[PDB]
Symmetry: D2
Subunit: 461 residues, 4 copies
């Protein structure tokens, strides 16, 4: 036994499952706003010998030896991270060791806050992420709701926008110490300047969680949150088209010096670094760190800006093709990579639409809309451009995807009229032959349309 046997040679059971997952990715139209297809160059570094190296600590401040090579790889990842987002290495540092986006956020809170210090983020049904302090009326859901006291700021139900006025009012009372400016389901751009005004007033840290829009920020196709934020966390994947990892950007240098004359310095670096390790994480995923450095240099290139520009064009094309077919969009449309469709004005919900679209090899996700009246049957979908755009989808290709969706939406509408509760709805798509065959037809037309496009990564897995 050498450990050099191939995967297809030594574990055929796992090899098939790998192929069937690649086949499902190829034959399907992935429209999840957070998903993307990773480059082969990054996947070759993700499954590399860097997995074997334990390198606890930081470059030049590690606690083992033998880290001579992973030091260069992390600092290359740090330099590629600052270059990708056009940051001055004198004003910004970046930690590239977080295991994912969730650990990146929790590291920031641990770094800058004490347990039960106060946190403000967009509520999850309104478009905020779990790690922004999601707490329901019955349960503390996220660990950020347990180890810290969080109060959500809400959308304006009449506009679909963040209610920046209500947030300013409720922040003067809640007196938070950190406010997250970041979304998981919000089709418009965040007024980071208005967020900094609120944070500057209530003396709170302004954290920007550009996880969903990191690639669009790097390509300079939307306003960058670094002009206003003190801390910026992001997800390595999603729009950046990398492996699964996380980043924490922090201001460094001089914050302010009335009468003193001595520059009051930024104190984020040592706190952020200590929270990531040794506080929260163990050994860094060096194979991830190298895979994201691969993807970060890809984001510095002229290729990547043309890719992000197509994502906004495709999102805009998806927006108009849905509006011009009888669908409403919350906030009216989009300014980024995603669309938030309202399907109450169509007669369907998000849950049954997700199930009927999943059965035709179209992957979306339900999303709470402002005008909802329940949570098991939300009235909207969330559709993302970046996934199919990496398959060289263009505007006219996304309008054809919308034609495939409204086809399935109408099958669900017809099935909803014959059913009532959701479980017998889902049970209907599995037994009724007329609905079963009509689903298999739409899926076969969808799989045919999808397989023709290229797919990043390897050929077979």
């Amino acid at each position: 036994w050498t450990g050099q046997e191939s995967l297809s040679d030594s574990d055929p059971e796992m090899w098939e499952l790998l192929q069937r997952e690649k086949d499902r990715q190829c034959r399907g139209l992935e429209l999840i706003a957070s998903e993307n297809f990773c480059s082969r160059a990054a996947l070759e570094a993700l499954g590399s010998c860097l997995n074997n190296k334990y390198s606890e600590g930081y470059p030049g401040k590690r606690f083992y030896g033998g880290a001579e090579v992973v030091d260069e790889i992390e600092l290359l990842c740090q330099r590629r991270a600052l270059e990708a987002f056009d940051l001055d290495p004198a004003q910004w540092g970046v930690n590239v060791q977080p295991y994912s986006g969730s650990p990146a956020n929790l590291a920031v809170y641990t770094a800058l806050l004490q347990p039960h210090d106060r946190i403000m983020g967009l509520d999850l049904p309104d478009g905020g992420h779990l790690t922004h302090g999601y707490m329901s009326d019955v349960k503390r859901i996220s660990a950020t709701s347990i180890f810290f006291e969080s109060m959500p700021y809400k959308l304006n139900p009449k506009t679909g926008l963040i209610d920046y006025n209500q947030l300013a009012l409720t922040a003067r009372l809640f007196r938070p110490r950190l406010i997250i400016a970041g979304t998981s389901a919000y089709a418009r751009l965040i007024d980071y300047a208005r967020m900094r005004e609120v944070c500057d007033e209530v003396k709170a840290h302004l954290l920007a969680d550009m996880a969903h829009i990191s690639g669009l920020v790097a390509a300079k196709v939307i306003p960058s949150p670094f002009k206003h934020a003190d801390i910026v966390t992001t997800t390595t994947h999603k729009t950046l088209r990398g492996a699964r990892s996380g980043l924490i950007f922090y201001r460094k240098g001089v914050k302010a010096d009335p009468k003193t004359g001595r520059e009051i310095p930024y104190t984020f670096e040592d706190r952020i670094n200590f929270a990531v390790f040794p506080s929260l994480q163990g050994g860094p995923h060096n194979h991830a760190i190298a895979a994201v450095a691969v993807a970060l240099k890809q984001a510095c290139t002229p290729m990547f800006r043309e890719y992000s520009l197509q994502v906004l064009k495709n999102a805009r094309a998806m927006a108009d093709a849905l509006l011009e077919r009888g669908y409403s969009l919350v906030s009216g449309g989009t300014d980024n990579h995603l669309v938030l469709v309202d399907l109450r004005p169509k007669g369907l919900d998000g849950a049954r639409a997700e199930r009927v679209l999943e059965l035709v090899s179209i992957t979306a996700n339900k999303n709470t809309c402002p005008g909802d009246r329940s949570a098991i049957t939300p009235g909207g979908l969330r559709l993302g451009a970046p996934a199919l755009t990496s398959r060289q989808f263009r505007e006219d290709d996304f309008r054809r995807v919308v034609d495939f969706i409204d086809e399935g939406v109408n099958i669900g509408l017809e099935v909803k009229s014959k059913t009532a509760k959701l479980q017998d709805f889902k049970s209907f798509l599995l037994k009724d032959s007329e609905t079963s065959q009509r689903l298999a037809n739409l899926r076969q037309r969808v799989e045919q349309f999808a397989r023709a496009f290229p797919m990043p990564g390897f050929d077979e897995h």
Copy 2:
């Protein structure tokens, strides 16, 4: 841009750094007790398209769709996990989504304990891990000591073993809600039955964190902590030789003045803590790679593997004893050796830097006696990594020979030098010293390069 280019063609700067580390691993004698060389079969799954699938939730309970295949992958991983440790699915469940061992431990505390509830683990300088609640005398270090109140238990320095009696004494007073039985630097078997008795008395959950020995447990070459622990966490790398991920095993079934059978309530709380509480979408590429490794751990090859890991560390132990070195607790019953170099006149900090310069990677270790602040006078040496490279007993005796030459080099430098930075700068500047190091480095790298190396050929 097709996204299908080679790494060598797309990014040659990074592809060169990949081959630089591949050579550093092939040419070095890797003695870090927690490091292993992952197989190629697992790495192929690790760097696969599964990185693309967002499968938040659990098999059959996802929050999007399209998780058709990865549901089968996560379920295959759970089944291979229970199979590798001889567990009955009716009595044991397992969560395979922890990103690493540290998130695995933080998940258990979040699942079973309230903020500031009390935790007890082996102190870090005494051999415990950070995530066991390590607190300094001046600062809360691990987040386990921030969100939970930790009090450590200690080694008996006379014997180098866990003072199970002082643990019993202090747990009665501290009244912890959870006690951790698991070590990062400990050469002996942990009395899990004694831990369970202590936990039963103060009504505490017994968490066995078997990250360093999970492979030995899987091969059934050392006693299994599953016969005594309520919760078991492990890293999927180290002795398990998988990709970097984490596992949380938990009890299912019955935990019986009414004839009422009280059930186990771990599954829902443990799974909810991993997601949605702590993590986000799981790394399905890592899950699939550790499923490749867990399949390897159920094979007679892995039992031969772990049997040799024991034989090698015992051979390295006996060799060090023959050359006049002291071992904490006198020897080893598992995969690592704790060397006390204070007798031979050298500390661990100096020995670590000299051995690093000759491609012998180890880490310093505080010995029972000298406290945390004092420069550690010991080293922690591990067998698993080189054993994966088909090392045998006489090969580790050669590694001990190389270590001896390195130590005696460090001794002559210490005789020529004063402070530690003077020592570290003398190793790079002194012409004779840097030459005798270059010689030993060459003899080490030639010896190390001859052995096979799991993984790919070039990266």
Copy 3:
């Protein structure tokens, strides 16, 4: 040495200070809304041998013996407490062991909440008490702000009322577990029904802190908070005219039983009692408990309702006599025992008015007003009726007190024009002979007017 020597015989130094304090109380016009003059019957029980008895525990559940007599006294105090506020002993229990009002409030939080559970009270500058969770933008002030997470609800600056609409909005976001309905400086009555609506919606406990208005509630001259509140704490003194102690009223019996049929019972009693002892307090002040039982039976009598009716008449008389002399009142006037005067529309502040009135033997307190612009110089006074009303002051006597105040207010106005900062203002009243003698004149006329009225308690101390 027997310990039976009189105080005047054994400690003349302390005896004089006792007399000079009684003389200061007699010669002065006490207008502090929280102060009152205690009956001699209660002071005889306050300084009784009950101080000597340690009786940790509760009647029938004590941990020493020899508590046969203090058991009857506490239950008499419990029965007199339920009778004074017209409560059914089947629906309400009362703990009479709290040392004061602050410990009574902290006992309720400890009983019903975990550390860092969420609390909502009126902000201190808006009229709420310290123990309702007062936290500033710089410091956690009250222990209720430290051991629990509190967010204040505010007044409406345009009306002077509690902004019940903003409170309902911010409670849906803050998700509190307890809301305090109680004030220390609020001239109108609290909509306890609207408070119960908010608490019933966000699933929070409704605590009523009638400390300032307990005597008015007992005399049934204002709406009682027991019709809506789950927990009611109060101060033994203030309007109830007792010694210094505290009470905690809690619902007991049956709270609700859909489908169950088994009555879901109230669970406050064992929790409230355990928090007071053994959690928070040590041995009960049995000499206080007996003094408040004395004062609680006085509150059941027809005498006491005529006393409380005069307090509202005197507060109303003080309100109109100030309005009809050029003073503004926040909320316009009063419906209880206190008046909240606005002295920005007069040219003075609350701090310099408190100092000039203190120098004429008139005791008041500064109070933040809605239209303020600082905190060292608040723009208002808080004047209370219950103190002088216990001296048999009537409406025409309170209008004469207002004439004495506006006299001093105009001396401060004249001194403010000659000064600038507050410290040289206060320094001016001490040196300048023209202002010094004019102050001594107004004080002598005030001391003459005050000494003529009767004074409850003893003659000399």
Copy 4:
């Protein structure tokens, strides 16, 4: 209604209950170690018009006016406080606003510690007070164990003394921020110098809670904890014989690689914790009464008083030893005696109920050995109360005689009875037993009524 009526005329129901307790105190042998009989001079101030003054804040820093006189009263109280304990105002301040001893201790923790910071005190069954962080095995009992994390230290049951060595061992592991040196049921002197050494090592504040012995310390008849403690709290009653209030003494001055003298930062934090943090307006009537008592404690009368308190408890100790009773730690060096009745065949719960029925008030006490849940087999007997009634050595020997008759009565009932409620019901129902109790009660009450009683004549 003038509000100047007598209590007898205004409320005869309550005035009768006042005289019922006055008689119960005059006729009973008060042996509760924490109870004393307050002088009339203090009670006159206790039930004075100072109950009317709301003086929130501190002398010179009030938040209303009219505090002209009570500022002098609170300042006179602070000066008499420092004088009674031989303290230098340059090295010691004092807060006199604590409502009782329990609020006094909660103030110190709030002043110096963050929520969930670590506290160490003597365990409650071992002699520590509730406010030292008492936690059960099933429930957080004292609020000190809710808002702060407490770990207790224990008696050495072999000697009945504080195990200062196990304290040192466990404080190194638990790392408390504050340690409490103070007892509610402990017959021996606390080694404050050893506590200070432990506190200096783990960098902890030493709080001496001298509620039970403050009078002995004031009379300088036992060593003063002010020579070793950072913070000192006390009740103003118990041995100080004042009205029920509390005191917090704290260090002022200097607490000296730069020639920098680090100052003490207790005054502002301690005062801010008492108000505005925890309390509201102070009870100026209680403050004035404890100022009356502190003046009494500076007199040669109080030194004679406390000297007799020691002599009386030693006489009660020697008497109990002569009759064959066991004493925890073998005797007493202060004001109380811990009797072990497990040898004589009776528990403390039974002895407490029998002695209560014959007007001998004491409280049961858990002995070193039997745990908290077991019915306590001991009693805590105190000297201060009866010593204030001019008891002398031969008088306490008579009290021991009465206790012996009571115990032997309880033994015969235990021989006639099974469970504890059967024991308690037998004492009221059995005709002969209830008669022999009535006889002993009469002989006790006649003996007790003859002695003078501090306070008023009738109430």
